[PDB]
Paper text:
In addition to their membrane‐bound chlorophyll a/c light‐harvesting antenna, the cryptophyte algae have evolved a unique phycobiliprotein antenna system located in the thylakoid lumen. The basic unit of this antenna consists of two copies of an αβ protomer where the α and β subunits scaffold different combinations of a limited number of linear tetrapyrrole chromophores. While the β subunit is highly conserved, encoded by a single plastid gene, the nuclear‐encoded α subunits have evolved diversified multigene families. By careful examination of three newly determined crystal structures in comparison with three previously obtained, we show how the α subunit amino acid sequences control chromophore conformations and hence spectral properties even when the chromophores are identical.
The crystal structure of PE566 has four copies of the closed form (αLβ).(αSβ) complex in the asymmetric unit. The structure of PE566 is most like that of PE545 (RMSD 0.23 Å over Cα 266 atoms), with near identity between the β subunits (167/178 residues) and significant identity in the α subunits (sequence identity: αL—48/78 residues; and αS—39/70 residues). In contrast, the α19 chromophore of PE566 is bilin 618 and two sites on the β subunit, β50/61 and β158, have bilin 584 chromophores, while the β82 chromophore is PEB, as per PE545 (Note: the PE566 β subunit has an additional residue at the N‐terminus, hence the bilins are actually attached to Cys51, Cys62, Cys83, and Cys159, however, we keep the conventional bilin nomenclature to facilitate comparison between proteins). Comparing the structures of PE566 and PE545 shows only a few distinguishing features. One notable difference is in the loop between helices hG and hH which differs in the β subunit attached to αL in the two structures. This loop interacts with pyrrole ring D in the β50/61 chromophore of its neighboring β subunit with the aliphatic portion of Lys151 making van der Waals contact with the face of pyrrole ring D. In contrast, this surface is solvent exposed in PE545. Despite having no sequence similarity and being one residue longer, the structure of the chromophore loop (residues Thr19 to Ile34) in PE566 αL is nearly identical to that of PE545 with PE566 His22 and Glu26 forming a salt bridge that supports the central pyrrole rings of the α19 chromophore (vs. Arg21 and Glu25 in PE545) and the side chain of Glu26 making a hydrogen bond to the nitrogen in pyrrole ring D, as seen in PE545.
Residue numbers in the entry:
A (entry chain D): 1 to 70
B (entry chain C): 15 to 178
C (entry chain B): 1 to 78
D (entry chain A): 2 to 8, 15 to 178
């Protein structure tokens, strides 16, 4: 059952083949593939999902102007 | 709360475990990289087809309600993206859908409107996965992702059934 | 010269022909007995703001360097 | 053309005032549709332009890039929105007086002293321009507003010219 925490899995996909990051790739802690998979990475983190008042106001303001009409 | 990272050898192995690994991660990428747009468009479309949702008696009235609704849309979208990453719906059903209809019934969150919000997010996701745009408008190699599109569509259908 | 206040005109177009569910009390001027009574242009000077938390969400979307919708040529690189 | 809202409080123009306003700007009905097709897509236009700027120059969010840190990305996303909205008011009013006086004048000097990269700003503005033109002619992928079929190429060219004034000012 859901825990009502408001959290969800945030996935970030890094297909960074050919990238010169200018700094080390230290996030992935496992072993190297010795191939292009060493330039790509997936990040998954359970995080509280939060929506600002500005965003909510923005969606309203861009929705109220397109309501179905006669 | 600590983030997990899957690259190099671990990522090599992962793409041996899930089907169509490379395409599958492109599919996930196309959704999460457009997450805020998918969620806002679905909520906006839910409302434009039913303006009473933002009338004083509607369930999206006030910034507080709108934000909670946009938040829920993102929670659901993200659990669907994790189902696509994983290749099954187990976590989606257990951590998101199970108990959710009962929650919405006690809060009075309208089921007819959630049904439409979910179907629009589904339409977004299918279009990004089964993207028929020209090669010059794609960041990925043009190919057939119809199986992944049907799979993600199925995950949305499980959302719809759970809170329908 | 602009005043660095971050204020900008926010336009909201209400083409609400047929919408009797909302009583048109915001516009206070004269009416026409025509569809123009059912439409309204709203303009307001608003301080445009983006929170750091919201910017972090956009960064999370952009950092794939493949955050593009259906439209537009793919001009990005890695 | 008419700068009609130069006067905190919101202004509301409907009924008789709106009937008159549409006579004071050229192609009143079409113009309001054109403005609406842009403003109703404002969040996507800005996000697409800033993302496209970044995906063409990934180093912008590297530690030495001008969009690095949440504070800077927020300022850039904000500026993109500010510029788009002043352009939308130029299209509503039918001229660029407010666009120049209240947004663009002194803006290049500000970006120069801050080190905001002009070549990257140019691409953001160029992408927003491409979005707006497509929304005016209703050729974007999303077409959520319904209009009577007609030719709005003059209005599309007009809004394109407003974006060109932005590009010339901060280029
Ligand atoms: C190439 C696209 C690029 C240029 C050119 C540039 O100037 N900056 C570039 C990329 C970039 N990467 C990050 C941050 C992260 N990169 C990864 C993937 C990387 N890390 C690993 O351990 C592995 C191993 C296979 C890879 C391929 C990750 C996981 C990053 C951060 C995750 C997080 O939780 O924040 C950035 C952001 C700024 C920085 O360099 O830290 C850029 C700009
Ligand atoms: C019809 C689209 C509709 C249904 C059906 C429904 O349930 N709610 C509907 C519309 C709606 N309108 C507003 C608020 C505003 N509407 C206008 C334009 C309106 N007001 C006028 O004076 C005139 C012309 C003389 C018209 C055409 C404006 C300016 C509104 C408020 C702006 C502001 O700054 O607050 C809403 C929001 C909730 C409410 O009823 O107040 C809805 C949902
Ligand atoms: C449907 C999903 C779309 C599509 C995708 C597609 N991708 C293909 C090949 C491919 N994609 C990646 C990146 C992927 N792999 C990763 O590890 C990660 C990030 C961690 C991502 C993102 C790679 C590396 C590859 C190919 C590698 C290789 O050596 O071949 C293909 C080609 C077929 C295939 O390889 O399976 C397709 C197709 N194409 C579409 O048209 C839609 C929009
Ligand atoms: C380019 C912009 C697109 C286009 C527009 C178009 N609109 C037309 C007629 C029309 N539009 C409105 C809504 C408008 N009027 C308002 O007051 C407001 C909101 C306050 C909005 C929004 C109306 C009411 C009308 C018609 C009024 C009438 O009595 O006839 C037309 C027809 C030509 C014309 O009327 O000038 C066009 C054309 N059509 C397109 O195909 C492109 C994408
Ligand atoms: C109110 C008048 C109203 C709207 C608001 C809009 C809502 C809506 N949107 C769709 C279908 C898709 N929306 C997508 C979103 C994006 N595309 C992009 O390029 C950016 C990154 C995203 C945010 C705008 C996508 C990809 C969709 C799939 C293609 C398509 O257009 O169908 C729908 C469709 C519902 C359905 O198919 O049942 C709606 C209702 N439409 C409105 O009327
Ligand atoms: C980084 C990977 C990257 C991008 C992000 C993208 C930048 C880019 N976008 C365009 C052209 C248009 N973008 C539009 C935005 C939307 N269309 C919709 O339906 C939703 C609601 C809006 C937000 C996503 C529109 C309407 C465009 C015009 C039509 C078209 O297909 O071009 C361009 C084009 C520049 C040019 O024409 O020279 C770019 C570069 N591309 C990336 O690689
Ligand atoms: C948007 C498409 C909907 C809509 C959504 C609203 N939800 C509101 C409160 C709420 N939502 C949840 C479920 C959410 N939390 C989780 O942990 C998970 C999954 C892990 C999910 C999917 C909960 C538990 C709650 C109550 C506590 C809270 O707010 O966090 C809400 C406000 C309710 C109120 O003010 O009475 C809204 C408006 N509303 C709509 O009209 C459409 C259909
Ligand atoms: C995004 C496409 C850009 C980019 C933008 C940044 N701007 C930064 C600070 C800044 N911007 C303005 C102009 C803005 N304020 C106004 O009142 C008006 C018009 C009415 C506009 C157009 C000002 C005055 C300032 C300084 C004060 C402030 O931040 O509010 C900024 C941070 C600079 C820093 O702290 O180092 C950024 C990142 N940056 C990019 O890389 C792209 C090209």
């Amino acid at each position: 059952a859901d825990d009502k925490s408001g959290k969800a899995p945030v996935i970030t996909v890094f297909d960074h083949r050919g990238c010169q990051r200018g700094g080390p790739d230290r996030e992935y802690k496992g072993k190297k593939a010795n191939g292009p998979d060493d330039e790509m990475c997936v990040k998954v983190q359970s995080a509280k999902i939060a929506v600002s008042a500005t965003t909510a106001d923005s969606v309203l303001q861009q929705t109220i102007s397109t309501l179905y009409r006669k | 709360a600590k983030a997990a990272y899957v690259g190099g050898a671990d990522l090599q192995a992962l793409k041996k475990f899930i089907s169509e690994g490379n395409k599958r991660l492109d599919a996930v990428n196309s959704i999460v990289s457009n997450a805020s747009c998918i969620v806002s468009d679905a909520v906006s479309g839910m409302i434009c087809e039913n303006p009473s949702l933002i009338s004083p008696s509607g369930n999206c009235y006030t910034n507080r309600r709108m934000a909670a609704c946009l938040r829920d849309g993102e929670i659901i979208l993200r659990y669907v993206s994790y189902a696509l990453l994983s290749g099954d719906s187990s976590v989606l059903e257990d951590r998101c859908l199970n108990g959710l209809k009962e929650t919405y019934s006690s809060l009075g969150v309208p089921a007819n409107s959630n049904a439409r919000a979910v179907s629009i997010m589904k339409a977004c996701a299918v279009a990004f996965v089964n993207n028929t745009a020209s090669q010059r408008k794609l960041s990925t190699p043009q190919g057939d992702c119809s199986a992944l599109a049907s799979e993600v569509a199925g995950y949305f259908d499980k959302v719809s059934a759970a809170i329908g | 010269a602009f005043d660095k206040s971050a204020k900008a005109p926010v336009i909201t177009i209400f083409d609400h022909r047929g919408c009797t569910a909302h009583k048109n009390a915001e516009y206070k001027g004269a009416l026409t007995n025509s569809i123009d009574d059912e439409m309204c242009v709203k303009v307001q000077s608003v301080k445009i703001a983006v929170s750091e938390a919201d910017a972090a969400k956009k960064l999370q979307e952009f950092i794939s360097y493949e955050a593009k919708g259906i439209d537009g040529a793919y001009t990005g690189r890695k």
